[PDB]
């Protein structure tokens, strides 16, 4: 049982109702972080940064960020520090968010996919484990250190 | 014609080597951040966030970043000050991402196209204005302010 912290915008509202319901009958814990309601000219980065900073203060607590593409909602997502937001547009992409990038967050554009295909995008991405590999823990290292100081690393050649 | 920042580890050298050559024939100038060989133990970081350093301090310049799946490229670019990027699968999110989240770089996945497939979503990217509309705007003004002053912005009610 995961807990997942929820955002979206407009696009991606109906979709993140879906999943909230979805995460409860699979044995989850969801947790939402707005939109509370519909509203058509609202603004995504607001409900990305709840829950992207909600989950980085919760060790071991997944996210799940909607908007139309997904992809403005990620890159909010991705300026809180220490969050990793992949974009899943598959199920392969949101198994090997979990596997290779130990991606806390993922992206999912409610525009993009059937209600089906975006509830099995859900599902790989919260029973993927991740795979602790010395190569993938030393490029989530690397990055950390660039997130604590913002100095460019050299490149190797 | 366009200055194009590409970065890309092992796993998308050689789908790299493809779209500099395809972006020289269609009247671009691409500009090679690394890796310059192919090594397959090589970390992605250094490269993607060389490419969006480079990118936002140059005025009008897009960039690329490739991998396997993209999206530990994509992550590491949105970790740079300024820089949104993009997960592009498609012909649609690569031309949505600079209407819509005006998007000075996009992650491509390597392991997930064709070469034919990931060179029509490169010329979607470059070739899409962004729409400079007023709530496109707000939105990536308020995600600025937030990478300014690690400030979340209050949510709606
Ligand atoms: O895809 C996104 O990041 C946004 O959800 C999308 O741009 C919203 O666009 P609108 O619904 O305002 O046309
Ligand atoms: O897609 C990515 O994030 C990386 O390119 C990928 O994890 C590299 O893994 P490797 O090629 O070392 O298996």
């Known amino acids: 049982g995961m807990r997942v912290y929820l955002g979206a915008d407009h696009a991606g509202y109906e979709l993140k ?3 909230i319901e979805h995460l409860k009958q699979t044995g989850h814990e969801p947790i939402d972080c707005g939109a509370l309601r519909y509203d058509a000219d609202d603004d995504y980065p607001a409900f990305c940064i709840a829950a992207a900073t909600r989950t980085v203060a919760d060790p071991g607590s997944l996210g799940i960020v909607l908007g139309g593409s ?4 990620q890159i909010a997502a991705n300026k809180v520090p220490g969050a990793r937001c992949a974009l899943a547009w598959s199920v392969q992409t949101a198994a090997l968010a979990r596997e290779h990038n130990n991606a806390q967050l993922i ?13 099995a995008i859900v599902d790989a991405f919260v029973t993927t484990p991740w795979s602790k590999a010395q190569r993938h823990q030393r490029r989530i290292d690397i990055l950390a250190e660039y997130e604590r100081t913002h100095e460019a690393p050299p490149v190797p050649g």
């Open 17 to 19: 109702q879906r999943i």
């Open 70 to 73: 997904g992809n403005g909602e």
């Open 107 to 119: 992206g999912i554009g409610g525009r993009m996919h059937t209600v089906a295909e975006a509830l």
